[PDB]
């Protein structure tokens, strides 16, 4: 056994990182990519001296002797601040993610945060919007449960070559009927001044899933003039003050929680009037 120790770069802009090697005391290197288990080729034996550019996936690397030291290479992904257009519905689930060069093969991998699913796409080019896509039938139950999912996408122009995978992105998504499940609970109206009320609600279930919740919207309806006003609220805030109310007028308040791609279902309406 040789006393060689590995190093790894941080994930670069290309979604690659070089596994390097140094000797400080025949031998060969066995490389096993753990992420994306549904791929056909998962291991390769290499000469120690050539130092491949891995992806952000998890790897097992071992020095094997020919007459074993092993390192579990941690995952190192790239996280997108922009949420993906993932739509889960009655007939199936569909994804869109930023594509790169043409004839690219993508592997989509997800797991509920806190059932490892794997999907391998056929080679596809970017659409006129610069996006790649894939869809699943309802039978697949692809992110059909109302939970927060962690997703990682990989890309390769030669999926049969293990050392050519690159990381695309990682992201979070709330599955199932997120619009309905995200409805805020415990909406309450409290007397704040002679002409104003404070509206408070419990944080949406979407707020526990990173990056999913875009904003809250508070709708107030004047039951006499039938006029309607909407007030957007930062997702870090669960309180808003409604002002300019008229005495004797009845009012209705509802709250909804919106994602980047879905309008949320309104809460049960609250009826009130100035005391």
């Amino acid at each position, epitope marked *: 056994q040789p006393q060689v120790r590995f190093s790894v770069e941080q994930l670069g802009q290309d979604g*690659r990182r070089r596994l390097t090697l140094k000797e400080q005391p*025949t031998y*060969r290197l066995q490389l096993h990519m753990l992420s994306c288990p549904c791929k056909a*080729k998962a291991t*390769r*034996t*290499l*000469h120690l*001296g*050539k*130092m*491949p*550019y891995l992806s952000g996936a998890a790897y097992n690397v071992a020095v094997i002797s*020919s007459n074993n030291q092993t390192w579990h290479i941690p995952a190192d992904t790239h996280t997108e601040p922009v949420a993906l257009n993932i739509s889960v519905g009655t007939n199936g689930t569909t994804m869109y993610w930023p594509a790169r*060069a043409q004839s690219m093969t993508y592997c989509i991998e997800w797991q509920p945060v806190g059932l490892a699913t794997c999907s391998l796409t056929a080679p596809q080019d970017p659409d006129p919007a610069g996006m790649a896509t894939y869809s699943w039938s309802r039978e697949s139950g692809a992110m059909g449960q109302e939970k927060c999912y962690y997703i990682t996408i990989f890309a390769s*122009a*030669h999926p*049969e*070559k293990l*050392t*050519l995978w690159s990381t695309v992105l990682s992201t979070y998504h709330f599955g199932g009927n997120a619009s309905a499940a995200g409805t805020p609970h415990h909406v309450s109206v409290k007397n704040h001044s002679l002409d104003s009320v404070s509206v408070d609600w419990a944080p949406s279930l979407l707020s526990t899933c990173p990056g999913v919740l875009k904003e809250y919207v508070v709708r107030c309806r004047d039951e006499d003039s039938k006029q309607v006003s909407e007030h957007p609220v930062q997702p870090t805030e669960t309180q808003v003050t409604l002002s300019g109310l008229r005495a004797g007028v009845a009012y209705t308040v509802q709250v909804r929680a919106d994602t980047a791609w879905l309008r949320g279902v309104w809460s049960q309406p609250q009826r009130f009037s100035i005391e």
Partner: antibody
Amino acid sequence: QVQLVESGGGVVQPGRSLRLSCAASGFTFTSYGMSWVRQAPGKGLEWVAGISYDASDTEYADSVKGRFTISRDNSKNTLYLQMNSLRAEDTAVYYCARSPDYIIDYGFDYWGRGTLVTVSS
Amino acid sequence: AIQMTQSPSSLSASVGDRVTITCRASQGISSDLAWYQQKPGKAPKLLIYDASSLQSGVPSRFSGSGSGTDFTLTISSLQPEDFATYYCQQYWWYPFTFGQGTKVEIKR
């Protein structure tokens, strides 16, 4: 379409020098390793030299080590082979070949047309 | 350097025959082995990589196998455009080395 066009070939006297060039088009030159492969008349293929995508790695065959220098100019999509102290055995058709990865690895998926280099007085 | 020895150096066959070419390596190279086809006056064309992976666009009558030091290229049913020279090449370690070649000629 991917294309590799070699130039710079011709006649060179023994002991002199010659510089071959490869003009790449149809792909992102900065993302692939490149190699030179030569074939003497009526003989088999002989790998000459290879270079990684960022020019940090260079490798040479035994018969050309110390006499040849491979280099790349990624701003101009050009591959170079500097040949010094040429002998008669270096007479061959020199091909330009692309490697599919960042590093020098795997097979050659794209080749040039080749250029004849004759070393003779 | 790793020596790559092919067998046979040449062979004559007919259309429809099953052709088998062997490639042997002086050292173990696992699966880091490629196969090329070259016709007179043309650049080689890559047929097989990773000892057994069929390059895109190559007919399915071609196939490779083997690991370590012994590898075989097989043409299940020889076709007229398959008569040519075939080379193996290891990319396990530097310097990359080719085999001496195997010329597949037509029998008459």
